Design a binder for this molecule. Structure first.
Ligand SMILES: C=CC(=O)NCCc1ccc(Cl)c(Oc2cc(Cl)cc(C#N)c2)c1
Lengths: 402, 532
């Protein structure tokens, strides 16, 4: 009931980010939503004395048809004062469920002097009327201070469930609660239904699990007949992997390509060449040497489009030091829409990153800036938004992860 | 009759900055006499109030004769206070576009300019608006004044005023959804499709509603001249536009970009000045000679957008709901870059038109595009980037966008294999480019004024020139791969354009990459030849 004093970081003004265009349906949904939040006192209209702004738009979460208000607090979160633990068990758990606990934030007042920086604008079509300007009175969904400030209340609500179930790992990131287990889904959902019940006894009606390899092994072909082209591709892949792995050698394989030969011609492997290829296999079976996570440095996520709905990704902090690699093969929403697939890949990769390290990575997207910025909000279903940059030059490496 | 007050808008100065302390300029006795007369009337009207000696702030006041009508006009120069006043959320950054307006049967104008001086200024801020009328012969203390209302020329006045008018009109617009109200200058524009009797009645209700806040309305005519447009009841168009060895002064005209929104086929690619410059090699569009008007928006009909390729990285589009009646038109210029193709540019035009249409009509239009469905499918399924264009249909209006070549995914059986390499000396700018093949074909060409990158491209060109219709090419040039894998159809480098022209003639091309200096036999032999 007593607000926590919050201030921006030293030497930084409040956010002043342009509101981007919205469709009529999203504007109509945002009006209905904000009209009701106004009556509930969560937000209040503001005047021209407020120069600050944060973009707003609308989404439909997974398996629901109801519009939800999403605010892009990325700029405010950067400039918000760092407010002063990550469970390594969450990644190791067999099954983790994700719960939207954001509505809980709306029962906590926001510091009076800080409300000015939560200002948002509902745009008008064709600029025909002025924008509807609001600011928050309660803790906003998507703000980094909202979990921080609410943490004191959250532990109190969850200590009963935690004592009753100690094997359950519980983790909170933004509006999301991550609840891990090693039990069966039916009882998992039963314990999950139990957690919601505690939440109803002050909330909304995602099932995920870890996969086998953290870093997917590099694999080489096993053939009985090698063409010149097969051996050229292999030498290329091994030269690339030699930037990651120490003792990769290609001399005995490159020697087979001696002469000016037709690409489709079969070349039998020499005994020296078979041994070299086997030693490289052995090298690639071991882990990468000296790969550490540093919480100070940013995480970097790279995505390649491999075609036919397949996508590859690598998370790292230093080049050739992969903390995780993976491959996403099917996106149900879009066999005809590359951008929907990419957007769902970014969301899956961010979720995994939240589980493993408890922070989102910076993405390098295989897309032109203008195409991505036009369409990603149409397919976004998460309450957080990561950072991203754009790759304009085709990487030669796409082959090596294929 | 009690009048509801206009709630003041709390204003503050920027943090750490204090108010203005500028020097009042010496005035002529005639000007001082003119200012004293004005301010006494303004004071009698409540717009300003005389202040005592306590206020330490001052803003200079000037007098300008208005068209020598034997009358003077007061001018207070708030430039300094504006620099020290807080920032505001201005709301006029985007103007409505006429093509987004809906047709209306009746549209009435009302004068609400009297409301500007009816909007109060924050009490605690008035002391910062102080100004001094100098005394005759400087023998008395000048008359001191401060503002009680939003001053003309102050930073906050435009934003505070509109936000005040909107707060006033909200009950009326909510309770009368059968009407629309737009605010331009000192006049309000109210439109409706009701019978002329009901429309005039509701205007009387608006005048009554404004009278509650004391705003009093007096007792134009279509077409309306607004923001460089002409707004007729059934059509809209731009206001007239106007254009020698003096063209050297500027390319600010040129302003055909403003015309481009309704006049089709306008081009501005002359790109001169890419303060005195030569001009040559240009075409007068001269399509501005004949009048062209746009239509208003009917939300019950579909929105359509058709794009045409005009050449030289230029694209033109029309947005319409019914055939041959255009809501608006426009153009798109290719982005500055070294290599490009038509499919990427058409994709960027689609995205530009999409966002503009969201702005103006709140929805994406259906597209008609000069590209075959099969062409687009081949493109996006094989393009290394993710791409997408919204719902669209093919229109057979040449020039048609097409794919000009497609590289093979696998080596070609029975096609000759060309191993190419190129190298140059950084100091002499001399180099070699060449190939060796599986059939024993060879070439090495000596080159002057070249780089390692140009020799790598030239070697690929040689293999393409001297090969049959089907050919396998092995290079170690990551630079050449990055270029060809981006599928350019045109380039700024004439060497890339020549490779493109050779690729268009081939039936099958497989381009394979190998690492350099690793002993790949064909690459090793040609590398020794070209690095000599
Ligand atoms: C006579 C023309 C006509 O009727 N056009 C139909 C569109 C239309 C509808 C409703 C109104 Cl209120 C309107 O008036 C405006 C709008 C705007 Cl942006 C600016 C101005 C001004 N200066 C007036 C226009």
């Amino acid at each position: 009931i007593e607000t926590v004093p919050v201030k921006l970081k030293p030497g930084m003004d409040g956010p002043k980010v342009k509101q981007w265009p919205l469709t009529e349906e999203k504007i109509k949904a945002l009006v209905e939503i904000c009209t009701e939040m106004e009556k509930e006192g969560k937000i209040s209209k503001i005047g021209p004395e407020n120069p600050y702004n944060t973009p707003v738009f609308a989404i439909k979460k997974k398996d629901s048809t109801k519009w939800r208000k999403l605010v892009d607090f990325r700029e405010l979160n950067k400039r918000t004062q760092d407010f002063w633990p990550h469970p390594a068990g969450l990644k190791k758990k067999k099954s983790v469920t994700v719960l939207d606990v954001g509505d809980a934030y709306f029962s906590v007042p926001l510091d009076e002097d800080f409300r000015k920086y939560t200002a948002f604008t509902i745009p008008s079509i064709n600029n025909e009327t002025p924008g509807i300007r609001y600011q928050y009175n309660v803790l906003p969904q998507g703000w980094k201070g909202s979990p921080a400030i609410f943490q004191s209340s959250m532990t109190k609500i969850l200590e009963p469930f935690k004592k009753q179930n100690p094997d359950i790992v519980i983790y909170q990131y933004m509006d999301d609660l991550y609840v891990g287990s090693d039990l069966e889904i039916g009882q998992h959902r039963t314990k999950i239904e139990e957690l919601r019940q505690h939440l109803l006894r002050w909330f909304l009606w995602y099932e995920l699990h870890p996969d086998k390899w953290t870093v997917q092994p590099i694999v080489l072909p096993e053939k009985d007949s090698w063409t010149v082209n097969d051996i050229q591709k292999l030498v290329g892949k091994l030269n690339w992997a030699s930037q990651i792995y120490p003792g990769i050698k290609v001399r005995q394989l490159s020697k087979l390509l001696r002469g000016t030969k037709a690409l489709t011609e079969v070349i039998p492997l020499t005994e020296e060449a078979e041994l070299e290829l086997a030693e490289n296999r052995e090298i690639l079976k071991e882990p990468v040497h000296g790969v550490y996570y540093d919480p100070s440095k940013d995480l970097i996520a790279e995505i390649q489009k491999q075609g036919q709905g397949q996508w590859t990704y690598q998370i790292y902090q230093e080049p050739f030091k992969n903390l995780k690699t993976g491959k996403y093969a099917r996106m149900r929403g879009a066999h005809t829409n590359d951008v929907k697939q990419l957007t769902e890949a970014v969301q899956k990769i961010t979720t995994e990153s939240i589980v493993i390290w408890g922070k989102t990575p910076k993405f390098k997207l295989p897309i032109q800036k203008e195409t991505w910025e036009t369409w990603w909000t149409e397919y976004w279903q998460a309450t957080w938004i990561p950072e991203w940059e754009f790759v304009n030059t085709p990487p030669l490496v796409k082959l090596w992860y294929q | 009759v009690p009048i509801s007050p206009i709630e003041t808008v709390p204003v503050k100065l920027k943090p750490g900055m204090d108010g203005p302390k500028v020097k009042q300029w010496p005035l002529t006795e005639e000007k001082i006499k003119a200012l004293v007369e004005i301010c006494t009337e303004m004071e009698k009207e409540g717009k300003i109030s005389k202040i005592g000696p306590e206020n330490p702030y001052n803003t200079p006041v000037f007098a300008i004769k208005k068209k020598d009508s034997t009358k003077w006009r007061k001018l207070v120069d708030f430039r300094e206070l504006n620099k020290r006043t807080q920032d505001f959320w201005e709301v006029q950054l985007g103007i409505p576009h006429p093509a987004g307006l809906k047709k209306k049967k009746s549209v009435t104008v009302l004068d609400v300019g009297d409301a500007y001086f009816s909007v109060p200024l924050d009490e605690d801020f008035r002391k910062y608006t102080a100004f001094t009328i100098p005394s005759i012969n400087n023998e008395t203390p000048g008359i001191r004044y401060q503002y009680n209302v939003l001053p003309q020329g102050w930073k906050g006045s435009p934003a505070i005023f509109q936000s005040s008018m909107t707060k006033i009109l909200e009950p009326f617009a909510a309770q009368n959804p059968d009407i629309v109200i737009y605010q331009y200058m000192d006049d309000l524009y109210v439109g409706s499709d009701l019978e002329i009797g009901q429309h005039r009645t509701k205007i009387e209700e608006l005048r009554q509603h404004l009278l509650r806040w004391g705003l009093t309305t007096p007792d134009k005519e279509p077409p309306f001249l607004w923001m460089g447009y002409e707004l007729h009841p059934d059509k809209w168009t731009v206001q007239p536009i106007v254009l020698k060895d003096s063209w050297t002064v500027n390319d600010i005209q040129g302003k055909l970009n403003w015309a481009s929104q309704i006049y089709p086929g306008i081009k501005v690619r002359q790109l001169s000045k890419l303060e005195e410059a030569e001009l040559e090699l240009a075409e007068n569009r001269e399509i501005l000679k004949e009048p062209v008007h746009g239509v208003y928006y009917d939300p019950s009909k579909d929105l359509i957008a058709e794009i045409q390729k005009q050449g030289q990285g230029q694209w033109t589009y029309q947005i319409y709901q019914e055939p041959f009646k255009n809501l608006k038109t426009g153009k798109y210029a290719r982005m500055r870059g070294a290599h490009t193709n038509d499919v990427k540019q058409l994709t960027e035009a689609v995205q530009k038109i999409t966002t503009e249409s969201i702005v103006i009509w709140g929805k994406t239009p259906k597209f008609k595009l000069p590209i075959q469905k099969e062409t687009w499918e081949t493109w996006w399924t094989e393009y290394w980037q993710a791409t997408w264009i919204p719902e669209w249909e093919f229109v057979n209006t040449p020039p048609l966008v097409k794919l000009w070549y497609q590289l093979e995914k696998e080596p070609i059986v029975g096609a000759e294999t060309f191993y190419v390499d190129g190298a140059a000396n950084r100091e002499t700018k001399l180099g070699k480019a060449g190939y060796v093949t599986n059939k024993g074909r060879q070439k090495v060409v000596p080159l002057t004024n070249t780089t390692n990158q140009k020799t790598e491209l030239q070697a690929i060109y040689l293999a393409l020139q001297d090969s049959g219709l089907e050919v396998n090419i092995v290079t170690d040039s990551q630079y050449a791969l990055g270029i060809i894998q981006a599928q350019p159809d045109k380039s700024e480098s004439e060497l890339v354009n020549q490779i493109i022209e050779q690729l268009i003639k081939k039936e099958k091309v497989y381009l394979a990459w190998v690492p350099a200096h690793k002993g790949i036999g064909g690459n090793e032999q040609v590398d020794k030849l070209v690095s000599a």
